[PDB]
Structure formats: structure tokens, C-alpha cells
Coordinates of C-alpha atoms and ligand atoms in Angstrom, one line a residue:
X1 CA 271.1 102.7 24.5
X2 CA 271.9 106.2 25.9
X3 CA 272.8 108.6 22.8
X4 CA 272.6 112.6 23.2
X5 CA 273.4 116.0 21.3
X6 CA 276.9 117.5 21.3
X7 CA 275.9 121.4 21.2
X8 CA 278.2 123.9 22.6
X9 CA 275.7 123.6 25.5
X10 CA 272.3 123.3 26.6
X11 CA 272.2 119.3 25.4
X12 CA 269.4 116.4 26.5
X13 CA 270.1 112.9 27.2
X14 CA 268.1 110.2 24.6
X15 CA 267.2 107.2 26.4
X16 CA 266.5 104.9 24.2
X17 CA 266.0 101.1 25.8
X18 CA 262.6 98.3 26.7
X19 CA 261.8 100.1 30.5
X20 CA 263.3 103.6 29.9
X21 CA 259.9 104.7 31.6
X22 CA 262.1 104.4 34.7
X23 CA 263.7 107.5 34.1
X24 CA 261.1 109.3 34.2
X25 CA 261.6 109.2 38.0
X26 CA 264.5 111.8 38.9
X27 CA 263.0 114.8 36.8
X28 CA 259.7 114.8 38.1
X29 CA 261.5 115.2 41.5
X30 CA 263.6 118.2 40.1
X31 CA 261.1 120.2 39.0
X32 CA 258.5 122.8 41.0
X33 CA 255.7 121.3 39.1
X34 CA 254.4 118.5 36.3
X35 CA 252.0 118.8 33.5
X36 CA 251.1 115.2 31.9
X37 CA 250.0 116.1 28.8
X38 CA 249.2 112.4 27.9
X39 CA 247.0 111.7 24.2
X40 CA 243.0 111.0 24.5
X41 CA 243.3 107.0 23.9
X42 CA 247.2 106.7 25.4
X43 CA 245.5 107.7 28.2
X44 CA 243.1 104.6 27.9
X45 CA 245.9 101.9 27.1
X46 CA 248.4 103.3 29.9
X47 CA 246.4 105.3 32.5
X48 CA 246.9 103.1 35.3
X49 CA 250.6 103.5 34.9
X50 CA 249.8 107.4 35.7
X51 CA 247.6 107.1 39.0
X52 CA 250.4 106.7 41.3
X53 CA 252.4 109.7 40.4
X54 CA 249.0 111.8 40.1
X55 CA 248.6 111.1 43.5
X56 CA 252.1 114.1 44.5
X57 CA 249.7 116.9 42.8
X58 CA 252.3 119.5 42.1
X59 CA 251.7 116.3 39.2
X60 CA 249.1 117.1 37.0
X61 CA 247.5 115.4 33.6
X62 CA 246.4 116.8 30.9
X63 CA 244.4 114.6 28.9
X64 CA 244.4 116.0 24.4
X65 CA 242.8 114.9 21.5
X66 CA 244.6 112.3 19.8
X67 CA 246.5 112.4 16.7
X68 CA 246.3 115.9 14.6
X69 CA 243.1 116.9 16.4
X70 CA 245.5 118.0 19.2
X71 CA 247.4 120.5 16.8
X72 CA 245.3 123.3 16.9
X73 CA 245.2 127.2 17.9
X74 CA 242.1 126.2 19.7
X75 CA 243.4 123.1 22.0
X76 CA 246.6 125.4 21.6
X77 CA 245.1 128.1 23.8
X78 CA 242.6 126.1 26.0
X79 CA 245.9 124.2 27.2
X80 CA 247.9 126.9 27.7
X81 CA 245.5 128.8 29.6
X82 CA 244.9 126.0 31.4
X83 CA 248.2 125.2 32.7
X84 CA 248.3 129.4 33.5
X85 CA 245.4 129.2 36.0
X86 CA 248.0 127.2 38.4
X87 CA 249.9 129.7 38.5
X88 CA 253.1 127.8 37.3
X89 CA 256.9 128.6 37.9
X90 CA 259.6 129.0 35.1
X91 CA 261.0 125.9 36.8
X92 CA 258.3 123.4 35.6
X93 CA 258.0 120.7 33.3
X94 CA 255.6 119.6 30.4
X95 CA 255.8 115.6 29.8
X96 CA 254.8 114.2 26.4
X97 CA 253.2 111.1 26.6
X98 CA 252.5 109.6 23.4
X99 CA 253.1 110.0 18.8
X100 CA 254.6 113.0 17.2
X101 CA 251.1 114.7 17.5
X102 CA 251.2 115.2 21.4
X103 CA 255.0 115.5 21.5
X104 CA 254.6 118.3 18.8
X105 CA 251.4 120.1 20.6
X106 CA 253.2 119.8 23.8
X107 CA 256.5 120.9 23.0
X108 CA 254.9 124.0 21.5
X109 CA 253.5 124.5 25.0
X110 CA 256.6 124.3 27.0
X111 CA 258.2 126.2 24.4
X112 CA 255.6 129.1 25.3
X113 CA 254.9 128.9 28.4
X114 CA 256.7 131.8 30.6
X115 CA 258.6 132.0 27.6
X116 CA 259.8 128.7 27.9
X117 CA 260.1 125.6 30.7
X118 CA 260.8 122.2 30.9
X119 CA 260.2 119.8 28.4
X120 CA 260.3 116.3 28.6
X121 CA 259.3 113.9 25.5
X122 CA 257.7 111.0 26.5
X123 CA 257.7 108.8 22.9
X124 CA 255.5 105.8 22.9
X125 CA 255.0 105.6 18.7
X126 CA 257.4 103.8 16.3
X127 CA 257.3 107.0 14.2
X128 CA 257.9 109.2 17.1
X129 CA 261.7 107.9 17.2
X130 CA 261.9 110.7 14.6
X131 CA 259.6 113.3 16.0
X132 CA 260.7 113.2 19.7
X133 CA 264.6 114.4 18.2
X134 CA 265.3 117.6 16.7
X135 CA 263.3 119.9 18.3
X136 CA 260.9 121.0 15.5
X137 CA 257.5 121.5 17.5
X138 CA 254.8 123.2 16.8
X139 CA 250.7 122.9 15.2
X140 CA 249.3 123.0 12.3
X141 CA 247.5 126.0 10.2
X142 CA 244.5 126.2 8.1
X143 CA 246.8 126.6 4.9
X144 CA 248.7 123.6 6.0
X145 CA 250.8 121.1 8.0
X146 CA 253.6 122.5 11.0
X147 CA 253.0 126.1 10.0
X148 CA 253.3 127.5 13.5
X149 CA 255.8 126.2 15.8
X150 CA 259.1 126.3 17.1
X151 CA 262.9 124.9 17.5
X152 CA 262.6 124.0 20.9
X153 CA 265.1 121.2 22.2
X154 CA 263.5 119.2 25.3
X155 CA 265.4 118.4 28.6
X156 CA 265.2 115.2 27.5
X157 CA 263.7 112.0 25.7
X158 CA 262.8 109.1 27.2
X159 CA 262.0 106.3 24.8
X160 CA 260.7 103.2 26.0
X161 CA 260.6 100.7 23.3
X162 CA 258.2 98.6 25.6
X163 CA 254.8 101.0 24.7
X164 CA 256.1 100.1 20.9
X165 CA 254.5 96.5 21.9
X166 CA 250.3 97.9 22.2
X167 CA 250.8 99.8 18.6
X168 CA 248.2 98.5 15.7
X169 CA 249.3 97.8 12.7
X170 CA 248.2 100.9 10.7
X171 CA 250.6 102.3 13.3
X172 CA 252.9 100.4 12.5
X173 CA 252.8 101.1 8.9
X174 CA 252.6 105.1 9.8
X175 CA 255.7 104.9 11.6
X176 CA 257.6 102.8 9.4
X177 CA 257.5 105.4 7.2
X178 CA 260.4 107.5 8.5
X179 CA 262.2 104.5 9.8
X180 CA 262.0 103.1 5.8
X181 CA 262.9 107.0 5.5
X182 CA 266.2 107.2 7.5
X183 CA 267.1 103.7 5.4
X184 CA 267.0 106.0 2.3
X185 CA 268.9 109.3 3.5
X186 CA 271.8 106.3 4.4
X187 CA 271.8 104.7 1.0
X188 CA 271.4 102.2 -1.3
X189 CA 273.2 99.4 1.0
X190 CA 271.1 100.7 3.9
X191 CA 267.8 100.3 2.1
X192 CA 268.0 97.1 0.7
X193 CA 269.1 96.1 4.1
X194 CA 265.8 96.7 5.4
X195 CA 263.9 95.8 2.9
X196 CA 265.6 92.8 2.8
X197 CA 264.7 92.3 6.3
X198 CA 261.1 93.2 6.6
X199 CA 259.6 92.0 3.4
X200 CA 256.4 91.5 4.2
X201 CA 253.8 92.5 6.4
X202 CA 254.6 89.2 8.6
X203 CA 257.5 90.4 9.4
X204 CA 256.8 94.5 9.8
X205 CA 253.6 93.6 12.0
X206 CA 255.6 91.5 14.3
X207 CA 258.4 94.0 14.8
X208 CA 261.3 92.2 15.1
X209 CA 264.3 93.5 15.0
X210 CA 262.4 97.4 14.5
X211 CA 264.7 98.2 17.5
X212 CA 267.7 98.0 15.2
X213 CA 266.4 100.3 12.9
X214 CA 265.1 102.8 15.2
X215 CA 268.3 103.1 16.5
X216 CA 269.5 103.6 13.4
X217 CA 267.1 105.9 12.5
X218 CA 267.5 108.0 15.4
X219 CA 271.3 108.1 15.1
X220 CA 271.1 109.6 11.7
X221 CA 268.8 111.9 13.0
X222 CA 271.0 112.8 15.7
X223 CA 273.8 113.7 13.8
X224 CA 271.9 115.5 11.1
X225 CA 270.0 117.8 13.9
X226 CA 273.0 118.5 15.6
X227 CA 275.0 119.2 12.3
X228 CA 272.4 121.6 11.4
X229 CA 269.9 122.2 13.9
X230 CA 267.7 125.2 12.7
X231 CA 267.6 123.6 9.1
X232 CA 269.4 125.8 7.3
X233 CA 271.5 122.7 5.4
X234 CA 271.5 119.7 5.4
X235 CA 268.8 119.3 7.7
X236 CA 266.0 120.2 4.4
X237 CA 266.9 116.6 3.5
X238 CA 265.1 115.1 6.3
X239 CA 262.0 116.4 4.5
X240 CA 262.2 113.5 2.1
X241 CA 259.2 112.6 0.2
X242 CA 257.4 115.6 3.1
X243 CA 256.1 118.4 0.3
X244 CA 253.8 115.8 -1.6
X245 CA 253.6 113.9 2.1
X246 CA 252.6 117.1 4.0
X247 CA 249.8 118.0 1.3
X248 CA 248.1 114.7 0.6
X249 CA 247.7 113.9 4.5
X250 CA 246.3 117.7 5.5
X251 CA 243.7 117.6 3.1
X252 CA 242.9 113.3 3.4
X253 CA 243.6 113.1 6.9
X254 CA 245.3 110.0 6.4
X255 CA 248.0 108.8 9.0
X256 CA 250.9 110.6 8.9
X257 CA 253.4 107.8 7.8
X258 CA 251.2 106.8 5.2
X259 CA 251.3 110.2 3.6
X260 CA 255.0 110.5 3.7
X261 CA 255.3 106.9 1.7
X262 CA 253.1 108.4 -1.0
X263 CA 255.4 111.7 -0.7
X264 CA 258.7 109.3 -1.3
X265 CA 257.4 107.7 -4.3
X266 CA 255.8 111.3 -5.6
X267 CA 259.7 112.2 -5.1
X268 CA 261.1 109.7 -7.0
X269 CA 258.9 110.4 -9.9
X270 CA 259.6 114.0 -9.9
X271 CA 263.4 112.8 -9.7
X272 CA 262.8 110.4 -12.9
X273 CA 261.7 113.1 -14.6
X274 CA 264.3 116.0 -14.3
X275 CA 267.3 113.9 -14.0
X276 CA 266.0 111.0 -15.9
X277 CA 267.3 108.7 -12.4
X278 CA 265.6 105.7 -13.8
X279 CA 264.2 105.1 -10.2
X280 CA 262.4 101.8 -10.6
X281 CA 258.4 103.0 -9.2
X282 CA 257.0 99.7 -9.8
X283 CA 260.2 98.7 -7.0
X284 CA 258.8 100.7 -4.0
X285 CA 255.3 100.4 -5.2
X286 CA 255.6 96.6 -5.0
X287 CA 257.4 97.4 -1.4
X288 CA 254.4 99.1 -0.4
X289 CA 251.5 96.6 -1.5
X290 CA 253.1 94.0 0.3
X291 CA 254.0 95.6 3.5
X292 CA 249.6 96.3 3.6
X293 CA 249.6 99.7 2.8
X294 CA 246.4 100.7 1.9
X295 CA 246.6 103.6 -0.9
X296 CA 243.4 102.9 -2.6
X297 CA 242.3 106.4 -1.6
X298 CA 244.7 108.0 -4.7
X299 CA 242.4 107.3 -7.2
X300 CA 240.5 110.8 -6.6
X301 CA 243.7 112.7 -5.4
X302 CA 243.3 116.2 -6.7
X303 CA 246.4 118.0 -7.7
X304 CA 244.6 121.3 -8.2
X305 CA 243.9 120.8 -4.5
X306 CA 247.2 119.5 -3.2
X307 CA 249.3 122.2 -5.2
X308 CA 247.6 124.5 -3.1
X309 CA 248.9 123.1 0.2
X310 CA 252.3 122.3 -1.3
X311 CA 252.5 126.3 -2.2
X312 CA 252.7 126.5 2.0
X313 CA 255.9 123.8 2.2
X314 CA 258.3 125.3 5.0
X315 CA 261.1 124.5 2.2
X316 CA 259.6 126.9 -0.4
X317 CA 261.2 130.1 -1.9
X318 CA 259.6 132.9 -4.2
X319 CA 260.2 131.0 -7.3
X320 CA 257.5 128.4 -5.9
X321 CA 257.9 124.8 -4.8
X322 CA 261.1 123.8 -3.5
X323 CA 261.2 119.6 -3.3
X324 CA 263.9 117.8 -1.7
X325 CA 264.7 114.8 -4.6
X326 CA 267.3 111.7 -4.6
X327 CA 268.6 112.2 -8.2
X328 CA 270.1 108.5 -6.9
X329 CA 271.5 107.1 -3.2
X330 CA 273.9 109.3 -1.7
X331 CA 273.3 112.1 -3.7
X332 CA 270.2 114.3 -2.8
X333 CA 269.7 117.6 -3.9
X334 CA 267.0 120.5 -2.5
X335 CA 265.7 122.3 -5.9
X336 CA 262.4 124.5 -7.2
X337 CA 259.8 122.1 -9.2
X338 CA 257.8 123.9 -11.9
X339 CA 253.6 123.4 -11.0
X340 CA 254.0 122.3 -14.8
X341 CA 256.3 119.2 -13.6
X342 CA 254.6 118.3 -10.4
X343 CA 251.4 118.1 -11.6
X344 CA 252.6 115.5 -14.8
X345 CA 254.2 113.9 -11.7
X346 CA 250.5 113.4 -9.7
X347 CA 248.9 112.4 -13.0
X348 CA 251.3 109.7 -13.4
X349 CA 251.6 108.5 -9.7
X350 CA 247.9 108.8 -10.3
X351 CA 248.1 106.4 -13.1
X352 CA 250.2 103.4 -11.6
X353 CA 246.5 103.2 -9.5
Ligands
NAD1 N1 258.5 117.6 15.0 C1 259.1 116.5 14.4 O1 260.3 116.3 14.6 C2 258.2 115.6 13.6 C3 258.8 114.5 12.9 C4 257.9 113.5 12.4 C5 256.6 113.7 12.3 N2 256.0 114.7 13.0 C6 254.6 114.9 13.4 O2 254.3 113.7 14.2 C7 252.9 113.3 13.9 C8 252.9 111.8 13.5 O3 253.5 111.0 14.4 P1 252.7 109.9 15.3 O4 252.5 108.6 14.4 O5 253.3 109.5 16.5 O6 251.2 110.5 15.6 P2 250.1 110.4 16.6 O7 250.4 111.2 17.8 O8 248.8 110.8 16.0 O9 250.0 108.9 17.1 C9 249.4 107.9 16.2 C10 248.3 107.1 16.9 O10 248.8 106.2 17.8 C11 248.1 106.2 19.1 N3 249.1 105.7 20.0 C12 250.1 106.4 20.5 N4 251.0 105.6 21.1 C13 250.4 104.3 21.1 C14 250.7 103.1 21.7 N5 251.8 102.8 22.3 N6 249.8 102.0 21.5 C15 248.7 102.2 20.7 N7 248.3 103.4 20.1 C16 249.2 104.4 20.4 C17 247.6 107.7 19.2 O11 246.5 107.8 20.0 C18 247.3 108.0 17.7 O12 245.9 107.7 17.4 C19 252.4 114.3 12.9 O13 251.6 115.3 13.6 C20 253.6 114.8 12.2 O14 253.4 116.0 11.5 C21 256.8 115.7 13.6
CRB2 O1 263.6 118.5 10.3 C1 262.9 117.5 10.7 O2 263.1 117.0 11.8 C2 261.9 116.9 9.7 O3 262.2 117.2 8.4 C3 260.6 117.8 10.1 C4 259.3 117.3 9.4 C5 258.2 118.3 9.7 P1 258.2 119.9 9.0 O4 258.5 119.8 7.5 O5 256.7 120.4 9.2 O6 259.2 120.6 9.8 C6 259.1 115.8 9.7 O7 257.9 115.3 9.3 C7 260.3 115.0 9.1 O8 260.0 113.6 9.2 C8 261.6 115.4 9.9
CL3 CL1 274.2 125.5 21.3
CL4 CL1 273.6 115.2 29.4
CL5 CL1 253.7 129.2 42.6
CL6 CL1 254.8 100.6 29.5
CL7 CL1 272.6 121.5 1.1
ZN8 ZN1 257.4 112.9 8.9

């Protein structure tokens, strides 16, 4: 599946397919030089794959810290200068090999660099079907999640489902998160028709039929990106269940995905409780205990704390805390939350655990 954005101009190609890694092949050849920047233990699982075309060294790797270790000022800078002391050409590429985490990292370098070169995202997580799109990059802050960054849109994205088939399942369960995600932003038929489908952790773990819904996932990202690229719409939605998401995985260091499903039910609380949605919590909490999420950790979840992170969310205005809520399916609104309401709305969420 070949899909791509429909800008005025400057678009990139999403390859989407099992063995996409082949395309790989023509940029590398386009460009003056190559900077792998390939995540600590992807480089472990897949570094053989890499010898060959680190052999041509105007190819070069760059080996990160994985996950959100990578999405610092610090590895921000050593990088950069880094990739400076080769005295590199406006008409070179940096290649992102790996989950949101490098993709992000790395697309803040090539966004940078000289102003600005070639990017190339190299996805090889379930959840980076949704990072890899859009071209949100960036690192994170000491006040919070993605505050530096940039709208950056890569030449291209190469998404080879095959490196989908070495993920664990906590990995799994992280990046089912915004596939699960995407199911909501499409509605109630779309979301019982994956939960319908993966039920169980049986079924998540084994993957079948994930393809489907990544497609789908990134097709509704697609058009929501290119509808309204630097957010200043419809794009806020794509936030879902990301202000609660964003605070409780900065300060627990949990996975990302897992944060964002804690976020999603945080949202439809809030939602119950200024529209009175009836959203049935013991429904998605059920979801969740079956599909093996852990979220034990709650039981000590400070909002005190969180609130303070959550007073940094991207979607904010001067009032305070802006939330993006599903008052119900297909109708999703982006509104202020009083600290008053949010924090009734941890001490309950708190309470179902
Ligand atoms: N900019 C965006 O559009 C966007 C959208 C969604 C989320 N994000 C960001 O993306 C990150 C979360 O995404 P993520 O799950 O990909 O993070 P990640 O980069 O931390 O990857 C998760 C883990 O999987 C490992 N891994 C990578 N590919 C693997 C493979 N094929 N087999 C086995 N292990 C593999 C990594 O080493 C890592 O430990 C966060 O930093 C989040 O803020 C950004
Ligand atoms: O606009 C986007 O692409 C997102 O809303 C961007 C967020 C990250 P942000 O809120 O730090 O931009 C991402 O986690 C979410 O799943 C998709
Ligand atoms: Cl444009
Ligand atoms: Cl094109
Ligand atoms: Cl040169
Ligand atoms: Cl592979
Ligand atoms: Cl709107
Ligand atoms: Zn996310």
C-alpha cells in the first residue's frame, strides 16, 4: 500500500507494505551523504541488515539511546555536533530507524541541521504508524513531553510491516494504543469493530490482522494532517486521551502507549462529568485488563504532581487546561477543564483501582 499527502507541493510518498525496506535503496543513492540514526537495541535486533550499506561511507550510523532517553537537549546537541564535524551538505539525508522516539529525535535533527535536509522515516514500531506521519518532531523538556520541536514533513516513510514481527508484547500493547486511538476518532462502528476483533491478548499478541488497522489508522491520520497540518483545527483531536497521557508517562516513565490508554479513559471520565455522556468506564476498563495491560502503577498517581505537567499541554490557553473530550462517537469537542474537575476526575479514575 502506497498512500501520500496532497499539499500544494513539497509532498512524501508512504510506503506502507511487508519488505518496504527495499525502498530504502534509490534515496540513499540520491543524496551527497547518509546519517543512520538507528535506536540503541534496534541496532542489536537489525544491525546486520546495516553492515552492507555502511560499507559506501558517505553512509554513516548513528547509534541513540532507546526510547525517550534519546529526546534530550543533551543527545540533542552531541548528535548534531556530531553529524557537523563531517562537514555535511544541504543535500543530505537523516534516516530514522526505529519507534516514535528516534523518528522524533531524528526528525528534529534534520529539521535543524543547515536549516533543514533530508529526512527519511524509517518506522519499525506498531505505534510508530502514527508517529512517522504528520511531521510533529521534536524532544522533550524538563517541564514536560514534545515541548521543543518542530513541523517538519520527511521526504518520505518507509514502513515495513516485516520489523512489526521482532516487537514484545509490552510493545505491542504501547502501540496499540493509538491504533485503538484512530478506532475512536472514526466512531462507534469503528471501535467495536476492533474490539470485536482483538479481544483478548491472544489475539493482540499474535497480530493478526494489525495490518488492517494500521492502515486504517494511518489513513485517518493522513487526511487529518493534510486537512490541517500545523494543528490549528481539527488536527487538536488527534490529541485524544494525550493531556492526562502526556503527564502520567513524563513523570512514571511508563511506555508511551500505555500512558495514552490511561489518558483515554481519564478523558472519558472528564466527558461523563461535564456532559453527563454516560461513557460506560467499567467498558474500556474491562477492554484493557484483558488485552494485559498492566496499570497497577495508578494506585499512587499523584494529581498534585500530574496537574503540574498537564499546565505545559501544547493544547493549553491562559484560562488553563484545554482537554480534547468525546462528549459521544462522532462528536468531539476541544474545551478548558477547571483543576477543580480534573482532579475529581484522577480521584475517581483513581478509585476504579
Ligand atoms: N511526532 C509524532 O507524530 C508522535 C506521534 C505518536 C507518539 N509520538 C512519540 O513517539 C514515542 C512513542 O513511540 P514508540 O513506541 O515507537 O517509541 P520507542 O522509540 O521508544 O520504541 C519502543 C521500544 O521498542 C524498541 N523497538 C523498536 N522497534 C522494535 C522492533 N521492531 N522490535 C523490537 N523492539 C523494537 C525500542 O528500542 C524501544 O525500546 C514517544 O516519544 C511519543 O511522544 C510522537
Ligand atoms: O498531531 C499529532 O500528530 C498528535 O496529536 C501529536 C501527539 C504529540 P504532541 O501532543 O506532543 O504534539 C501524539 O502523541 C499524538 O498521538 C498525535
Ligand atoms: Cl504546502
Ligand atoms: Cl510523490
Ligand atoms: Cl563536503
Ligand atoms: Cl527486516
Ligand atoms: Cl475544531
Ligand atoms: Zn501518542
Amino acid at each position: 500500500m502506497k498512500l501520500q499527502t496532497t499539499y500544494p507541493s513539497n509532498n512524501y510518498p508512504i510506503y506502507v507494505e511487508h519488505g518496504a525496506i527495499k525502498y530504502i535503496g534509490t534515496y540513499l543513492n540520491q543524496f551527497d551523504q547518509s546519517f543512520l540514526l538507528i535506536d540503541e537495541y534496534v541496532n542489536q535486533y537489525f544491525a546486520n541488515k546495516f553492515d552492507d550499506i555502511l560499507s559506501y561511507e558517505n553512509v554513516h550510523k548513528v547509534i541513540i539511546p532507546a526510547g525517550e532517553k534519546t529526546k534530550t537537549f543533551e543527545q540533542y546537541q552531541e548528535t548534531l555536533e556530531y553529524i557537523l564535524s563531517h562537514h555535511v551538505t544541504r543535500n543530505t539525508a537523516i534516516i530514522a530507524v526505529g519507534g516514535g522516539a528516534t523518528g522524533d529525535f531524528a526528525g528534529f535533527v534534520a529539521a535543524t541541521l543547515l536549516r533543514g535536509v533530508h529526512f527519511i522515516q524509517v518506522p519499525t514500531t506498531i505505534l510508530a504508524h502514527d508517529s512517522s506521519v504528520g511531521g510533529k518532531v521534536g524532544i522533550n523538556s524538563k517541564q514536560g513531553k514534545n515541548l521543543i520541536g518542530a513541523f517538519y514533513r520527511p521526504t518520505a516513510v518507509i514502513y515495513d510491516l516485516d520489523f512489526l514481527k521482532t516487537l514484545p508484547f509490552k510493545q505491542i500493547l504501547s502501540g496499540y494504543a493509538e491504533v485503538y486511538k484512530h478506532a475512536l476518532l472514526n466512531g462507534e462502528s469503528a471501535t467495536q469493530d476492533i474490539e470485536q476483533h482483538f479481544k483478548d491478548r491472544e489475539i493482540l499478541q499474535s497480530l493478526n490482522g494489525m495490518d488492517k488497522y494500521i492502515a486504517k489508522g494511518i489513513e485517518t491520520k493522513l487526511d487529518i494532517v493534510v486537512a490541517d497540518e500545523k494543528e490549528q483545527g481539527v488536527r487538536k483531536f488527534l490529541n485524544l486521551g494525550h493531556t492526562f497521557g502526556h503527564a502520567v508517562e513524563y513523570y512514571h516513565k511508563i511506555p508511551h502507549g500505555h500512558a495514552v490508554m490511561v489518558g483515554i479513559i481519564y478523558q472519558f471520565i472528564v466527558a461523563n462529568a461535564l456532559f453527563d455522556s454516560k461513557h460506560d468506564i467499567s467498558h474500556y476498563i474491562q477492554y484493557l485488563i484483558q488485552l494485559g495491560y498492566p496499570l497497577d502503577m495508578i494506585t499512587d498517581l499523584d494529581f498534585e504532581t500530574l496537574y503540574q505537567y498537564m499546565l505545559s499541554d501544547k493544547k493549553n490557553d491562559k484560562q488553563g487546561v484545554q482537554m480534547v473530550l468525546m462528549r459521544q462517537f462522532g462528536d468531539i469537542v476541544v474545551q478548558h477543564v477547571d483543576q477543580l474537575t480534573l482532579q475529581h476526575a484522577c480521584e475517581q479514575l483513581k478509585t476504579y483501582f
